[PDB]
């Protein structure tokens, strides 16, 4: 079962998709997926859609929304900050918890790239009601990656205009000021339930070493990593995306279906 | 107004978005937008959503669906052919024609890249009921671009496997067999209503010369070209995207809001 859904708060409408298992009756586990920077809820080569349908096959529902300023949701990219996507995510969690078909004890979070940073922080904020966490190429170093651009041509334009063009998207100086005050590693530490990190070794956006840092600095024994050998940032191949999906589904199967 | 919509036919379910003006009610003009190859209804840097919202502002509604096999719609990419997207497009036009809010005399088509090839053929096939046509970087040379790979590494893989991996998408030999029989230039020739072609000079996917071929071989004086100087294939900058959308909205405003 796949059907479009809508969230509205503070005059903002978020547009998303919800999947529920056809066979199962009653309350089901739910995985919430957060997309990345300039991405949307379908994500690269439809990997989020494929992930939703793979979960549905094992009895696990899901929702995927576009953050405010991206995709089908309301707003322009220039209004978005990392913190405004955090507040979207809290509203998305609230939406899921309030669905009559949700098992509130079996809600999982999944995030890709900057969406992995969102997922890690929301997991920590709601550590007693998020059952499991999956991080795909999580951009915990997003603040550094943005600040590194301030000394390049982006920084000079930003100073003249208050925004920069990142390729058909208006990135506001508000985004830079907001993210420069955040430490994703610190804000994510303290989540004690099971974590799965999926990272490709040839990731040129979020270098593979970031997953080393997350295993070392953020989590304890509750986190394990699936390394996709030679894969790029979004697992852009049939074999790579299949490994990413299948490992994440089996992980969510283990953590959300029993206990 | 923006809302999710569905079409179910021949066991296939297509999923899309419909926009209606808020400030003008009753029967309104409608623009159907077709996305490109491996794209989806949001399209590159959300340009289709931005287009839908810019049309709303001038009193023009729109729909945009994911083709079967792409995005939010049903199906695997390996099930898709150019001809199956053409049949999708026929069902989308039927859907639009059957909405009570649609002015049946004021329906326009827009297509990007391979979606532009879809729009050109559909406009010609329904030439007496499509009031205006907008082509963005139209991939009328799609058959040649596919057959050009038959002598490259893709061709050798295709022969061994019956499909190729184009980056997390499975492209079937059925797609190759189907498109090798199609001449998009010939199938679009004869549409006599107004046409706008928008093309970037630095397009490296569909070379700008293709627009020269379309102006010469496909349409008469009813076609006009807007050249976006120095732009790439999907107008990936704020200024390029702004020009593409503004010129296309003013064209649809002139052609659909007449009389
Ligand atoms: C003070 C001026 C600052 C200007 C900053 C410009 C930044 C332009 C965007 C750079 C993004 C780089 C990192 C992308 C990382 C991966 C994200 C995923 O999701
Ligand atoms: C005999 C078959 C051999 C293999 C063919 C592989 C083709 C792989 C995809 C090639 C796409 C080329 C054009 C991309 C740009 C134009 C369309 C947009 O939309
Ligand atoms: C406009 C290009 C859309 C993606 C085409 C990909 C073809 C195979 C590239 C390796
Ligand atoms: C592959 C053909 C490209 C034609 C446009 C080139 C623009 C400068 C790179
Ligand atoms: C992982 C890349 C996301 C888009 C970045 C755009 C600015 C370089
Ligand atoms: C920008 C860092 C990239 C690290 C992986 C490089 C693989 C060729
Ligand atoms: Cl949608």
Residue numbers in the entry:
A (entry chain A), B (entry chain B): 1 to 259
The authors write:
In this work, we determined the structure of the enzyme revealing a long-chain C18 monoacylglycerol (MAG) bound to the active site, which was taken up from its expression host. In both protomers of the active Tth MAG lipase structure, we found additional extended ligand electron density pointing away from the active site crossing through a 15 Å long tunnel formed by the HBH lid domain. As we did not add any substrate to the crystallization buffer, bound ligands can only originate from the Escherichia (E.) coli expression host FA pool. To independently identify the ligand content of the extended electron density, we analyzed the crystals of the active enzyme by reversed phase liquid chromatography followed by mass spectrometry (LC-MS). A single peak found in the elution diagram corresponded to the glycerol monostearate (2,3-dihydroxypropyloctadecanoate), suggesting that under the given sample preparation and crystallization conditions Tth MAG lipase products cannot be released. Based on these data, we modeled a monostearate (C18) acyl ligand into the electron density of the active Tth MAG lipase structure. Since we observed significant connecting density between the terminal C1 carbon of the C18 monoacyl ligand and both the γ-hydroxyl oxygen of Ser113 and the O1 oxygen of the glycerol moiety, unrestrained refinement produced distances between these atoms in the range of 2.2–2.6 Å. The resulting model, which was confirmed by an omit electron density map, supports the presence of a loosely coordinated tetrahedral MAG reaction intermediate, closely matching the geometry of covalently bound tetrahedral reaction mimics in a previously established MAG lipase12. The distal part of the C18 MAG reaction intermediate involving carbon atoms C11 to C18 is held by a hydrophobic tunnel across the Tth MAG lipase HBH lid domain, which is open at both ends. In conclusion, our structural data are strongly suggestive of the hydrophobic lid tunnel to be crucial for positioning long-chain MAG esters to allow efficient turnover by lipase hydrolysis.
